């Protein structure tokens, strides 16, 4: 929605040189101080413990909003993001020179006889794709809109008159029709951008085929350097295509355009790539990032992430009556109703905190959070349960945890 | 357009435009039209077209096609170019580039014949043939298409079929041999092939390009041509003579086949209208047929040079 | 409703200078809350002895007019203030000449000073509360009564935004996930000065068309919430299928922020609770549901109970008035009601008019029983179903109620005129 | 789109080949010892690229897939048939001796008409020949052909005649069976190469199917199009009822009548649509199918030379403060075990490795690691690689395209 002035950089790797696109970008810092780079935490919350009851209950709500405590795993993440994002501007170098010439004295020569052997100009082969599979809850949009906000969206560059798209987020279509995945992407693109789309490039006669083609003439006169797809566990049974129309499409789009294709889903979704090897092969193109819920011990210690990841949420309280230690029983019990599930922490806070808040006293113990527990995650119940049994085909009875 | 073909030697760039049409499978002529030209609202013809340079910049690539080279080798303009004049040829010349249709047609006072003659289609026989050893194609040409001659000059007689250019204005017509040629049984005369092949010359010719008289230079190369042959009185005419020397070199089944029957019991006559002053742009037959009854041993290009010299 | 705009701030940093949220009526703890709410009848005792006919439309008036807030009202009023000041943190007004920020960021970073910088302003979790509860209990009168403190609409001087915080939509008996789009404008043409439904509401569009201008609407108002009442009455056949309605209703959160509160039967539960995925984004802000008030849900009879029985039994408008109130009668209430508030002031009217029409001007619990037996044939299901306990017969039947009941006061009142 | 370059003319010195500009124009083949270093690629890699640090060294690492080629004994056969097929297919197409201009006048016949087997000279002769190209997935068909292609100059324009040659024409089919989306993506593919417009000018009028079929082969040969090339002839198999044969059956016209060559390029899916028929195969295959399968250890009761020229010729490309001189058997071993001579698991499981010894902190590249690489981000592609590796027919005998 934003235009950003672009200020040009230089990068030590010698295989990007002079690319106005990498080169654009921010400069390139270590992994380990990546992670710095998305803590955040709530401000000014030293001394409101003595204002009033409304202001301390809707401070407390803005917990899950505001509270992001990078772990171990987001350095990976984070890389791979990084170089998928400059490696597929590597073959679209916008500064060409004077290969005119060039190439018209190499035919001569060779023509001639003097030289041997010349090669000419050759297009850009498929990018990189990048698979992203996790249990639902454990922050794969959170996570990538915040490692994304470093990289601003739309830069514009003053010497040529192409708009850098750097990153696009769509959903995939929620009836698993191709038809408006193909919509859902003109739709993104008029929400970061000032012009319009819908009406303009909408036209119903194209075929999906023929979208393929419609939406190519905007994402390759853009400089889009990432498509995210998110939300890829409903083409599982979908309506428009039988076997594998729904990602015939992605593979062409992939092999003509060269736009990096990143897919986050559910592990429902490893059976539609895990069916063949042509399909298989560009699914995992880049490597395959799988994730898991928190363990609470590693190898025969406790894990010092988790203990870190509660110990610093521990200190948000605004209770009168509020603890500076934390007990292992709490931690223990806290464990065992969030089985380490990402936002079943969050959520069991807050609404402990809110109940304390209003019940009158200013404590939190574990009848409290199992009491809230009980009333308040009723929905959550039976899933938690199949993780708290283990069997992989009693959780595979539902369709959206690692099983 | 990305591959306007080359124009073979001797053909007119009506056909070279047709035959660009049926490379690249235009069939809908208003097609073809927006494409080679881009102005739906053009009037097709055979022979002193318009709208050129646009011809040329399809050509530009390649150098030699310039717009002299299209004007003055793949129209018929030589024929209208020498006896016009200079400052309307230098006009006419200047005018083709653009767009005025019209202009052309109407400023050239021998091609403002109004009512177009036999708009009809012409071909010739035995040419098909030898084009078709040779270049793989049948197209029109130069030699066929003379305004007032149905002969070719090398072979007897052309062959005419149905349609007209005037039948459809908006379209380009390439011949086609396997589609079969009308061919029913002709019979010639042998003193218009003659004529033919007497004017053919006139089409390629270099000199042709720098070389146009004026209508007093014509005035008086005929006065002199008069006095030296003979035919002549004091500063009169012998009004007889004039006339058997057309009538032993023509007959008069030609004349009247051409559309040039003597009058000489009247006054008004196209003979004498060339013997007297000369007020405008005489046909090129009117000057042909006076030549080749008169002076038989000269060709087209010596007479243009005599008649020009003084 | 149009009521123009006053800013008094709050003591919540994270609403710091949003002219939305200050514009919003000052935060009330909660003895405000619950004491906003309560209304019931004056009953002077000047109107005792008078006509019968004046007395029997003023009892017909009771069920309209009387109200007891039971213990979730508090409950539910702190959720729905939640909600609707905590959508607006990522649509505030309040955004300066962000340009130049963003501008020297970027050039700071390229510097090598700025390690980091965060280039985004669309920071907004979609918010969502499915409200459901049985048919009845006071998912719309408590509902309005809940909504009707806020404000509809807010105008501001400096800007030029029409504030609409709550908006509330119901479906037609054979339903539609059509006219969805044309009962938002036909409301939204009310609530505000305009002709939206007939400068571009026509019906050449389609439904996707609807959507999307929906969301430039709701875009061009700052629409705090939405409300859809019932979905009960949308059908299952005609809009294709049990999991393309769940489908559309999950796309109606391309809707930027607008909390939506979806309200129906717990027979639209199933198509929600299928796996963890939709039962964490449909409890976005916890579950809430909407049961009805036990008797007894401690050891100790509910004191709300008790309250609402004597609060009810104290509007008796007789000549013959007895002050005290049974416990056998509280009991019989219990039973016949099961605790729902659809149905005890409307037996509680209907016999009390009976003994208008019989003359006794009296109440008697025989008189409960009878009209117990007789008048409530249409709603046994639901009866026995809550008498049992049975969640199953509560919900097949949750779409049952009584026809058309004030009709049948409308002969009651000519058989008591007669 | 792509640089035009201007033709200039050798003297060949076959007898058939005698003064067609269209193979006097074509750089010439070279000998069968070059062809093995003429298409050779390797990545830079300075010995002083060592000592910095890591963010920047290891963005360098992902540049080996891309960057590194290593032609096979495969690669010169298919080199030298692709020369023969591009050279021998423009006899029929002289335009000296007036016979380029045979074909366009009987393509009018087709585009008037519609029935495209309308002959109007019986002199115009028909010589393009057909190939077939299959192999497993991941076994290098486009990278190969990207390679063996590049020293053409695709478009080369003719200053004496005005004939803009485009040796060759690579696009692919839709992602369903269609009919008319082909013959739309040759435009959008001629296009994009010629910078014109062909899409908007051929299909905005809403032509038919013939039609369209006859509009695109009239300017298939309006340009001297030499070699047709189409991507992933797996997808038709996806088609309508009789999609998967009428396209056969044009592509077995196309190569007989009309006179342009094609080439085909699928995985082994397309086996059953290629075994239709007799008369539907052989016609469609006339030099056969070309199979390609995963490199083998042994041979001959030896180490496959080929295997060991690739692997330790790779094996230099290490950006490791810590690396071994030599490369060890049994590192050899495992890397040929968890790849099962697939080219593209061999070359991105070494880059993960690389990638994750930079960023663990032990800079050594060892038979451990590259087994945790594997079993870690490698999870898609486990059980296909396990069948491949148990060598039981009936387990290839579903999906591992072989
Ligand atoms: N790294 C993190 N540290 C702390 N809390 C987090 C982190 N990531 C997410 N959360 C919390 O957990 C919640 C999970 O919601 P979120 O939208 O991230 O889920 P998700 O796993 O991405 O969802 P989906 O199933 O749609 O992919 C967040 O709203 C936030 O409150
Ligand atoms: N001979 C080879 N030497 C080195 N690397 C190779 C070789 N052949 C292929 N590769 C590499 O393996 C990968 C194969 O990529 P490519 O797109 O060509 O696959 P493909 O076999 O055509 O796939 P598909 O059949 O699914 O279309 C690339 O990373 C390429 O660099
Ligand atoms: N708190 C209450 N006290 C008395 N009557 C109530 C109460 N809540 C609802 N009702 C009765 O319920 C009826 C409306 O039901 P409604 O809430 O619309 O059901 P639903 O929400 O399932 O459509 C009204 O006629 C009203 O008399
Ligand atoms: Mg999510
Ligand atoms: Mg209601
Ligand atoms: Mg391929
Ligand atoms: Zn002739």
Not at chain 1, 259 to 273: C, S, W, Y
Request: net charge positive; charged share 20%.
């Amino acid at each position: 929605a934003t235009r950003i002035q672009a200020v040009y950089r230089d990068t030590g790797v010698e295989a990007y040189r002079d690319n106005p696109f990498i080169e654009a970008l921010p400069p390139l810092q270590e992994s380990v101080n990546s992670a710095a780079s998305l803590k955040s935490s709530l401000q000014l919350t030293s001394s409101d413990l003595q204002k009033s009851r409304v202001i301390r209950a809707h401070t407390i709500c803005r917990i899950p909003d505001d509270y992001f405590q990078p772990l171990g795993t987001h350095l990976l993440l984070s890389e791979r993001i990084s170089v998928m994002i400059r490696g597929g501007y590597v073959g679209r170098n916008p500064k060409t020179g004077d290969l005119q010439k060039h190439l018209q004295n190499g035919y001569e020569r060779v023509q001639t006889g003097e030289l041997e052997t010349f090669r000419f100009e050759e297009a850009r082969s498929t990018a990189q794709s990048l698979l992203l599979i996790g249990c639902s809850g454990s922050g794969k949009t959170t996570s990538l809109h915040r490692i994304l906000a470093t990289y601003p969206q739309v830069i514009y560059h003053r010497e040529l008159n192409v708009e850098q798209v750097v990153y696009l987020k769509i959903d995939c279509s929620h009836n698993g029709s191709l038809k408006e995945i193909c919509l859902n992407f003109f739709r993104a693109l008029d929400r970061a951008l000032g012009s319009n789309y819908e009406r303009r490039y909408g036209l119903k006669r194209h075929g999906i085929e023929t979208m393929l083609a419609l939406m190519s003439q905007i994402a390759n006169a853009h400089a889009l350097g990432l498509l995210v797809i998110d939300e890829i566990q409903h083409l599982s049974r979908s309506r428009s295509g039988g076997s594998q129309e729904m990602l015939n499409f992605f593979v062409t789009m992939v092999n003509i355009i060269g736009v990096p294709v990143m897919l986050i889903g559910t592990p429902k979704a490893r059976e539609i790539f895990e069916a063949d090897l042509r399909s298989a092969r560009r699914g995992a193109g880049f490597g395959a990032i799988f994730w898991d819920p928190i363990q609470q011990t590693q190898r025969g210690k406790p894990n010092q992430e988790w203990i870190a990841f509660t110990d610093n949420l521990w200190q948000l309280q605004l209770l009168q009556r509020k603890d500076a230690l934390l007990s292992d029983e709490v931690r223990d019990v806290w464990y065992e109703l969030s089985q380490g599930v990402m936002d079943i922490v969050v959520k069991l806070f807050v609404l402990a905190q809110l109940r304390a808040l209003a019940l009158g006293n200013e404590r939190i113990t574990a009848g409290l959070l199992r009491q809230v527990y009980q009333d308040e995650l009723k929905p959550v119940h039976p899933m938690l349960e199949a993780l708290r049994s283990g069997i992989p085909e009693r959780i595979a009875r539902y369709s959206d945890l690692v099983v | 357009m990305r591959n306007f073909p080359v124009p073979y030697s001797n053909e007119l760039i009506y056909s070279t435009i047709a035959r660009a049409g049926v490379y690249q499978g235009i069939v809908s002529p208003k097609q073809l039209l927006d494409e080679v030209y881009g102005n739906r609202k053009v009037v097709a013809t055979l022979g002193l077209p318009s709208h050129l340079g646009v011809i040329a910049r399809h050509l530009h690539q390649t150098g030699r096609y310039a717009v002299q080279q299209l004007i003055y080798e793949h129209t018929l303009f030589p024929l209208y170019a020498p006896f016009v004049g200079k400052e309307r040829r230098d006009e006419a010349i200047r005018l083709m580039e653009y767009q005025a249709q019209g202009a052309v047609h109407l400023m050239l006072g021998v091609a403002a014949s109004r009512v177009k003659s036999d708009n009809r289609f012409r071909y010739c026989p035995d040419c098909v043939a030898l084009q078709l050893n040779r270049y793989g194609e049948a197209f029109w040409q130069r030699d066929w298409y003379l305004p007032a001659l149905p002969y070719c000059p090398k072979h007897g007689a052309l062959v005419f079929f149905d349609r007209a250019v005037d039948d459809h204005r908006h379209q380009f017509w390439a011949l086609g041999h396997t589609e079969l040629l009308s061919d029913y049984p002709k019979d010639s005369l042998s003193q218009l092939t003659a004529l033919a092949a007497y004017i053919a010359p006139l089409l390629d010719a270099p000199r042709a390009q720098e070389l146009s008289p004026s209508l007093e230079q014509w005035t008086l190369f005929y006065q002199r041509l008069a006095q030296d042959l003979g035919l002549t009185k004091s500063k009169h005419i012998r009004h007889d003579l004039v006339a058997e020397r057309v009538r032993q070199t023509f007959s008069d089944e030609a004349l009247e086949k051409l559309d040039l029957k003597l009058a000489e019991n009247k006054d008004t006559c196209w003979l004498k209208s060339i013997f007297r002053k000369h007020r405008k742009a005489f046909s090129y037959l009117q000057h042909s047929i006076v030549w080749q009854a008169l002076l038989p041993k000269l060709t087209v290009i010596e007479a243009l040079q005599q008649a020009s010299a003084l």
